[PDB]
Amino acid sequence: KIDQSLSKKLPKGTIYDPFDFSMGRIHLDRKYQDIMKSGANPLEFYARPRILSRYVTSTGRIQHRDITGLSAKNQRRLSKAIRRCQAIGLM
């Protein structure tokens, strides 16, 4: 067998080109690799530690907007919700 990284699995029902059978395709795939990214207000999840534990680190540090990819407003609301959750004995 060979390492799965070095191989490319062409999905089912998809068209392909001969290029797809090449290291170029895998390399191009590597280089070019939710609830809050929506109309939902993150400040309504302040009592739901499971949901907003996805937007923190293993130690609990809120993730930068560069990571979360949220809008500025939803980043601010999410940070407020996480801090409030930390204060009220959850989180």
| Nearest distance from C-beta of residue 48 to another protein, angstroms | 28
Nearer to another protein, 17 or 59 (CB): 17
| Nearest distance from C-beta of residue 79 to another protein, angstroms | 18
CA distances from 28 to 32, 52, 70, 83, 90 (A): 6, 33, 26, 39, 43
| Contact positions vs another protein (CB under 8 A) | 1-2, 7, 9-17, 19, 21, 28-29, 32-33
Nearer to another protein, 37 or 83 (CB): 37
Nearest to 60 by CA among 40, 85, 77: 85
The tokens of 6 are what? Answer: 């070095």
